[PDB]
Amino acid sequence: PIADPYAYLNIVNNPDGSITRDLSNFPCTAATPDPSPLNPAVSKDLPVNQLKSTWLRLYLPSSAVQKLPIVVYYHGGGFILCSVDMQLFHDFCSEVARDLNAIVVSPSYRLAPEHRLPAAYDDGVEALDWIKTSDDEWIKSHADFSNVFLMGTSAGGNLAYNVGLRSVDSVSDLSPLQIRGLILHHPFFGGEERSESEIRLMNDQVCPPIVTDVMWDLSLPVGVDRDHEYSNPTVGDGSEKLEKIGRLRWKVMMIGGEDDPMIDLQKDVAKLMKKKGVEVVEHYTGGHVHGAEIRDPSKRKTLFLSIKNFIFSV
Incomplete structure (x- = not known):
C-alpha cells in the first residue's frame, strides 16, 4: 500500500507554495512533421498564448x-x-x-x-x-x-x-x-x-485515495475541499448546463475501469448526465486500473475502436 504519496508522485514541497518535480521518470519527445514508417502520425508544435507560455501539438x-x-x-x-x-x-x-x-x-x-x-x-x-x-x-x-x-x-x-x-x-x-x-x-x-470504490480499492497501487488527496489539495482553489464542482460534478444537482448539453445533442462517452478507485463517482456522473437528458455512451471494463490503456498499449485498440464507433454515431 502506498505510504508516501509525495514520493510516489516524485515531488517535493517548496517554501513558496510550489513543488519541485523530478522529471526524469517521464521523458519527452519532439514533434516529427515528416512522414516516417516508425511514426504513426506526423506532428508539429504551434504557440497559443505567449503570456501563459501555452502551446499545442498537432497530429495527422x-x-x-x-x-x-x-x-x-x-x-x-x-x-x-x-x-x-x-x-x-x-x-x-x-x-x-x-x-x-x-x-x-x-x-x-x-x-x-x-x-x-x-x-x-x-x-x-x-x-x-x-x-x-x-x-x-x-x-x-x-x-x-x-x-x-x-x-x-x-x-x-x-x-x-x-x-x-x-x-x-x-x-x-x-x-x-x-x-x-x-x-x-x-x-x-x-x-x-x-x-x-475508494474504500474498496484503498490499497490501489496506481492512483489510491492517499495520492488523489494530494493532487486535489494542490490543484483545487485555495480554501475549497473535494466536494467542489471542479472535483465532484455530482454535488448539489450537477451543473445547470447539463440539460443544455443534452438539448444541443452533444453526446458524452464515459470510459471507466472497474479497478479504478474513481469508478463509483465516474459512473454516478454518467447517471446524472443521463438524468439531465444527455445521451451518454458508457464503456466500463472489469479489471482495468486507472489509466489502463495509457500504461498498457495492448489495451489501446479496442478502446480506439469503441471511440471510433462513438464518433461515427453522431
Whole structure:
C-alpha cells in the first residue's frame, strides 16, 4: 500500500507554495512533421498564448500527408504533472490520430499548484478559440470543423468535461467550430467523503485515495475541499448546463475501469448526465486500473475502436 504519496508522485514541497518535480521518470519527445514508417502520425508544435507560455501539438495520420474529425485531447497528470510532449502522451495521441483517422489537437495547460484550477480550464477553452482562427495548413486542409470532439485522460478528462460546460453558453462564439461530443477517458473526479470504490480499492497501487488527496489539495482553489464542482460534478444537482448539453445533442462517452478507485463517482456522473437528458455512451471494463490503456498499449485498440464507433454515431 502506498505510504508516501509525495514520493510516489516524485515531488517535493517548496517554501513558496510550489513543488519541485523530478522529471526524469517521464521523458519527452519532439514533434516529427515528416512522414516516417516508425511514426504513426506526423506532428508539429504551434504557440497559443505567449503570456501563459501555452502551446499545442498537432497530429495527422501519416496517410493524410475527406476532412477528418477534430479530436481535441487533454493529457492527464492530476492537474499537477506531465506535458504534451511526454513520450507516453505523444505516442498515445499519434496512435489516436492513426486509428481514429482524426486530426488530434493536443493543447498544453498550466500546472498546479503554480496555477491552481480553474487555470487549466481557461487554457483548455483558449485552445478552442485558437482552432477557430488558425490559418495553419494542416488545419485548413484536413480538419473537419463540423466534427469537433473534446477528449481527455484522467485530469484531461475532467478538463474536457469542464471545457464542455464552459462552451455551452458560448456556442455562438464557437462557430465555425461545432462540438459534437465529449470523450471522458477515466476522468479525474473525487469527493470529500470516500466513495464505495475508494474504500474498496484503498490499497490501489496506481492512483489510491492517499495520492488523489494530494493532487486535489494542490490543484483545487485555495480554501475549497473535494466536494467542489471542479472535483465532484455530482454535488448539489450537477451543473445547470447539463440539460443544455443534452438539448444541443452533444453526446458524452464515459470510459471507466472497474479497478479504478474513481469508478463509483465516474459512473454516478454518467447517471446524472443521463438524468439531465444527455445521451451518454458508457464503456466500463472489469479489471482495468486507472489509466489502463495509457500504461498498457495492448489495451489501446479496442478502446480506439469503441471511440471510433462513438464518433461515427453522431
